[PDB]
Design a protein around this ligand. Structure first.
Ligand SMILES: CC(=O)N[C@H]1[C@H](O[C@H]2[C@H](O)[C@@H](NC(C)=O)[C@@H](OP(=O)(O)OP(=O)(O)OCC[C@H](C)CC/C=C(/C)CC/C=C(/C)CCC=C(C)C)O[C@@H]2CO)O[C@H](CO)[C@@H](O[C@@H]2O[C@H](CO[C@H]3O[C@H](CO)[C@@H](O)[C@H](O[C@H]4O[C@H](CO)[C@@H](O)[C@H](O)[C@@H]4O)[C@@H]3O)[C@@H](O)[C@H](O[C@H]3O[C@H](CO)[C@@H](O)[C@H](O)[C@@H]3O[C@H]3O[C@H](CO)[C@@H](O)[C@H](O)[C@@H]3O[C@H]3O[C@H](CO)[C@@H](O)[C@H](O[C@H]4O[C@H](CO)[C@@H](O)[C@H](O[C@H]5O[C@H](CO)[C@@H](O)[C@H](O)[C@H]5O[C@H]5O[C@H](CO)[C@@H](O)[C@H](O)[C@H]5O)[C@H]4O)[C@@H]3O)[C@@H]2O)[C@@H]1O
Ligand SMILES: *[C@@H]1O[C@H](CO)[C@@H](O[C@@H]2O[C@H](CO)[C@@H](O[C@@H]3O[C@H](CO[C@H]4O[C@H](CO)[C@@H](O)[C@H](O)[C@@H]4O)[C@@H](O)[C@H](O[C@H]4O[C@H](CO)[C@@H](O)[C@H](O)[C@@H]4O[C@H]4O[C@H](CO)[C@@H](O)[C@H](O)[C@@H]4O[C@H]4O[C@H](CO)[C@@H](O)[C@H](O)[C@@H]4O)[C@@H]3O)[C@H](O)[C@H]2NC(C)=O)[C@H](O)[C@H]1NC(C)=O
Ligand SMILES: CCCCC/C=C\C/C=C\CCCCCCCC(=O)O[C@H](COC(=O)CCCCCCCCCCCCCCC)COP(=O)([O-])OCC[N+](C)(C)C
Ligand SMILES: CCCCC/C=C\C/C=C\CCCCCCCC(=O)O[C@H](COC(=O)CCCCCCCCCCCCCCC)COP(=O)([O-])OCC[N+](C)(C)C
Ligand SMILES: [Mn+2]
Lengths: 163, 112, 41, 34, 110
C-alpha cells in the first residue's frame, strides 16, 4: 500500500514480494521472537502509508488515521522516536524547496495536534514530548508552519518586490 | 549494648504539593464562564450564525438524528469522564455510531 | 498507587479552571456545529 | 509431522510461485496499459 | 510606512471576505475566543506561579490549540476546496477529528 502511492501498483507488488522474505526482516521476525519489533516494524509502514496519503491528498481523516497509528506505535516500541523526527523533517524540507501548500498545513497540523496529545497518555512516555530533545523538532516545525501560512497569505496578497 | 533496647525509627513523608486557595480559583472559572457567554452572544448578535435555512421537510427527521449523533458522543465522553469503564464506553460508541453514521451521512447527502 | 487512586479533577481547587475551560470549549463546539449546518451562506 | 527438507522445498516453491506471478502481472500491466 | 500600506490592504481584504460569507465569520470568532481561552489559562499559571496538575493544564491548552488548528484547516478547505475532497467531506472529517481530540483531552485531565 505504501509503494502503490509512490509509483504504481506493480511496484507495490514487487516491494511486498521483496519484504515478504528478505533476511534483514526475517532475522527479527522469526517464529518465537516475541519482541516489540515484530509488531512495530508493521506499524511503522502502516503509519507512513497514511502520512503519505494525507500529505499528498490533504485529507484530515487520513491525517487522523496516521496520528492514531502513530499513537499505536509509541505504545508498542521505544523507537517511535524515528517517526516523530522523520515526519517533521519531510515537511521542513518541503518548506525549504518552496513547495508549501494548504494540504501540507492541514495534514501536518492535524497529525501533530492529535498524535502528540495522544502519545502523552502512555505512562512510560509522559511529558517527554514537551520537555525532551527528541520531540523539539516536531514543535519547531509546528511553529514554522504557522508563520509560513501567515506569510503565504500576506506575501501572496501584496506584490513580490514589496516583500 | 549490641543486644538490648534500641532507639525508635519513624519514616519521614514529604509535604504533598499545595493547592491554590479556593477564592482565587473561582474568579477564573467566572471569567471563563463570562467569556463563553460572550462568544455565544457575539455569534447570535453580529448577524452571523443567524438561525435561518432550517430544514423542515423529510430531511428534518434526519437533521435531528445528526444532532443526536453529535451530542450523544459528547454525552458518552461525559459519562466516561465521570467513572464509566472504557469497555462500556467502546460498546456505547459502537452502538451509537452504527445508526448515527448512516443518519448523518444521509443528512449530508440531502443537504446540498 | 494505581492510575485510579488519585484525587479526581473536581477535588483539586487548582484544576477547576482547566475543566471549566474544557467544558466551555466542548459546548462552544457543540453550538458551532449546529450553527454551521443550520445557517446558509 | 512435516520434516525440514520438505519445509525448505515448500518455502522455495512459495517464493518461486510468488515471484513468477509478480513478473507475469508486471508484463501484462506494462504491455496493455500506456 | 510600507507596513501601514500592507496592514490596511490586508484589513480591507479580510473584512470584505468575512462580510461576503458568514461561515468564515463563525470560524474566525471561534478561533479568536480559543486564543482568549489559552491566554486566560496561561495567565492563571503565571499569576499563581504553580502548575500542580500539569496533565490538566496540558489538557486545556492542548484542546484549545487543537481546536484552533482544526478550525484553520476547515477554513482553508472551505475558502478554496481541495481537488478530491468536497466541502461535505471536509466538514465530516473535521467533525470526526474534533470528536477524537475531545475524547483524548477528556482522558488526559483524569
Ligand atoms: C543499557 C541501558 O541503558 N538500559 C536501560 C534499559 O533498557 C533495557 C530495556 O529495558 C530492555 N527491555 C526489556 C523489555 O526488558 C532491553 O532492551 P531492548 O530490547 O533494546 O528495548 P527496545 O525498546 O526495543 O530498545 C531498542 C529500540 C531503540 C531505541 C532503537 C531506536 C530506533 C531509532 C530509529 C532511533 C533513531 C533516533 C533518532 C533521534 C533519529 C534522529 C532523526 C533525525 C534527527 C532526523 O534491554 C535494554 C538494555 O539492555 O531500560 C531501563 C528502564 O526500563 C533503563 O534504566 C533507566 O535509566 C534511566 C537513566 O538513568 C540515568 O539517569 C538518572 C536520572 O534519571 C541518573 O540518576 C542515573 O545515575 C544513577 O542514578 C541511580 C540513583 O540511585 C544510581 O543508583 C544508578 O547507579 C545510576 O548510575 C543514570 O545515570 C533512569 O532514569 C530510569 O529510572 C526510572 O526507572 C526506575 C525503574 O523503576 C525508577 O526507579 C526511577 O525512579 C525512574 O522511574 C521514574 O520514571 C518512571 C517512568 O519512566 C516512573 O514509573 C517512576 O515512578 C519514576 O517516576 C518518578 O520520577 C520521574 C522523574 O523524576 C517523575 O517524572 C515521575 O512523576 C511523573 O509520573 C508520575 C507517575 O505516573 C506521576 O504521578 C507524576 O505526575 C504527578 O506529579 C506531577 C508533578 O507534580 C504533577 O504535575 C502531575 O499533575 C501529577 O499527576 C498525578 O496526579 C494527578 C492529580 O493530582 C493525576 O491526574 C495524575 O493521574 C497523576 O499522575 C509525573 O510527574 C515520578 O516522580 C531507569 O533506571 C536502562 O538504563
Ligand atoms: C538501587 O539499588 C541500590 C542497592 O540495593 C539502592 O541503594 C540503597 O539505597 C538505600 C536507600 O535508598 C540506602 O539506604 C540508606 O543509606 C543511607 C546512607 O547511609 C550510609 O552512611 C551512614 C553514615 O551516615 C552509614 O551508617 C550507612 O551504613 C551507609 O553507609 C542511610 O543514611 C539511610 O539511613 C536512613 O534510612 C534507614 C532506612 O530508611 C534508617 O534505618 C536510618 O535510620 C536512616 O533513617 C533516617 O532517614 C529516614 C528518611 O530517609 C527517616 O525516616 C529516619 O527517621 C531517619 O531520619 C533521621 O535522619 C534524617 C537524615 O537522614 C533526619 O532528617 C531525621 O530528622 C532523622 O534524624 C539508608 O540506610 C542504601 O545504603 C543503598 N545501598 C547501596 C549499596 O547503595 C538504591 O536505593 C536502588 N535505587 C532505587 C531503588 O531507585
Ligand atoms: C468517532 C468517535 C471516536 C471516539 C474516539 C476513539 C478512539 C480514540 C483514539 C485514541 C485514544 C488515545 C487515548 C488512549 C486511552 C486508552 C483508554 C485506557 O487505556 O483505559 C484507561 C486506563 O488508563 C491507562 O492506564 C492509559 C494507559 C494507556 C495504555 C493503553 C494500551 C495501548 C493499546 C494500543 C491499542 C491496542 C489495540 C488492541 C487491538 C487492536 C482508563 O480505563 P478505566 O476502565 O480505568 O476508566 C477510567 C475512567 N476515568 C479515566 C474517568 C477514571
Ligand atoms: C491468507 C491465506 C494465507 C495462506 C498461506 C498461510 C499459511 C500456509 C503457509 C505455511 C503452512 C505451513 C505448513 C505446516 C503443516 C504442519 C502440519 C503437518 O505437517 O500436516 C501434515 C499433513 O498435511 C496434510 O496432508 C493436509 C492436506 C490438506 C490440504 C490443506 C487443506 C486446505 C486448508 C486451508 C483452507 C482451510 C479452510 C478452507 C475453507 C475456509 C502431517 O500431519 P500429521 O502427521 O502431523 O498429523 C495428522 C495425523 N494423521 C496423519 C493421522 C491425520
Ligand atoms: Mn527487546
Amino acid at each position: 500500500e505504501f509503494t502503490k502511492e509512490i509509483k504504481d501498483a506493480s511496484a507495490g507488488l514487487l516491494a511486498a514480494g521483496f519484504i515478504a522474505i528478505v533476511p534483514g526482516y526475517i532475522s527479527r521476525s522469526v517464529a518465537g521472537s516475541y519482541d516489540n519489533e515484530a509488531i512495530a516494524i508493521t506499524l511503522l509502514m502502516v503509519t507512513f502509508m497514511f502520512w503519505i496519503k494525507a500529505q499528498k491528498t490533504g485529507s484530515i481523516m487520513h491525517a487522523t488515521c496516521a496520528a492514531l497509528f502513530y499513537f499505536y506505535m509509541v505504545s508498542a516500541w521505544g523507537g517511535y522516536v524515528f517517526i516523530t523526527n522523520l515526519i517533521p523533517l519531510h515537511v521542513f524540507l518541503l518548506i525549504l524547496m518552496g513547495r508549501y501548500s494548504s494540504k501540507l498545513y492541514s495534514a501536518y497540523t492535524t497529525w501533530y495536534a492529535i498524535g502528540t496529545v495522544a502519545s502523552m497518555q502512555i505512562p512510560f512516555v509522559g511529558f517527554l514530548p514537551i520537555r525532551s530533545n527528541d520531540h523539539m523538532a516536531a514543535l519547531g516545525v509546528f511553529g514554522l508552519i504557522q508563520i509560513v501560512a501567515f506569510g503565504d497569505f500576506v506575501k501572496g496578497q501584496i506584490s513580490t518586490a514589496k516583500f | 549494648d549490641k543486644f538490648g533496647i534500641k532507639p525508635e525509627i519513624h519514616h519521614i513523608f514529604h509535604a504533598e504539593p499545595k493547592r491554590v486557595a479556593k477564592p482565587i480559583a473561582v474568579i477564573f472559572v467566572l471569567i471563563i464562564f463570562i467569556t463563553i457567554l460572550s462568544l455565544i452572544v457575539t455569534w447570535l448578535n453580529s448577524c452571523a450564525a443567524a438561525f435561518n435555512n432550517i430544514p423542515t421537510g423529510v430531511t428534518a427527521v434526519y437533521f435531528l438524528g445528526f444532532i443526536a449523533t453529535i451530542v450523544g458522543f459528547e454525552v458518552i465522553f461525559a459519562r466516561y469522564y465521570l467513572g464509566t469503564s472504557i469497555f462500556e464506553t467502546l460498546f456505547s460508541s459502537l452502538y451509537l455510531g452504527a445508526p448515527g453514521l448512516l443518519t448523518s451521512t444521509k443528512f449530508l447527502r440531502s443537504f446540498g | 498507587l494505581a492510575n485510579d487512586e488519585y484525587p479526581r479533577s473536581w477535588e483539586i481547587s487548582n484544576s477547576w479552571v482547566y475543566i471549566s475551560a474544557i467544558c466551555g470549549v466542548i459546548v462552544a463546539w457543540i453550538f458551532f456545529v449546529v450553527s454551521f449546518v443550520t445557517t446558509s451562506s | 509431522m512435516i520434516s525440514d527438507e520438505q519445509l525448505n522445498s515448500l518455502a522455495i516453491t512459495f517464493g518461486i510461485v510468488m515471484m513468477t506471478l509478480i513478473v507475469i502481472y508486471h508484463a501484462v500491466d506494462s504491455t496493455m496499459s500506456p | 510606512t510600507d507596513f501601514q500600506e500592507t496592514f490596511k490592504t490586508s484589513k480591507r481584504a479580510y473584512f470584505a471576505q468575512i462580510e461576503k460569507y458568514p461561515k468564515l465569520k463563525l470560524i474566525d470568532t471561534f478561533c479568536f475566543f480559543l486564543v482568549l481561552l489559552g491566554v486566560i489559562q496561561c495567565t492563571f499559571i503565571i499569576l499563581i506561579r504553580d502548575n500542580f496538575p500539569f496533565n490538566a493544564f496540558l489538557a486545556g491548552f492542548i484542546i484549545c490549540v487543537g481546536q484552533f488548528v482544526l478550525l484553520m484547516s476547515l477554513r482553508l478547505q472551505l475558502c478554496n476546496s481541495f481537488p478530491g475532497i468536497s466541502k461535505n467531506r471536509a466538514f465530516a472529517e473535521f467533525i470526526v477529528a474534533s470528536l477524537i481530540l475531545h475524547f483524548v483531552c477528556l482522558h488526559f485531565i483524569n
